[model samples]
Target: GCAGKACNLLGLTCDAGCFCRPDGVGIVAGVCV
Candidate 1:
């Protein structure tokens, strides 16, 4: 529900984890660093 909600740069996260895509994979190269 966070995908596309923000800009294409990065997304928003309210929980305590990485931004999981719709495929249930944790992002490891994008922002959130």
Candidate 2:
């Protein structure tokens, strides 16, 4: 689980209860595009 605030700061979104890219691609770990 991750914080949506952090993700939003990077211009990303929280999807599937995880951090995801703007394109809706989920990241397993860390905050990346």
**All models, RMSD in angstroms:** 7.4, 8.9
Residue lDDT tens for model 2, 1-33 = 554444433545656646443434464343423
Q: Go through the candidates in order and give each one's C-alpha lDDT.
A: 0.37, 0.45
TM-score for each prediction?
0.15, 0.15
lDDT of 1 by residue, 14-33 (tens): 23454533332553333321
Q: In model 2, which regions exceed 4 Å deviation?
A: 1-8, 16-33
Off by over 4 Å in 1: 1-10, 23-33
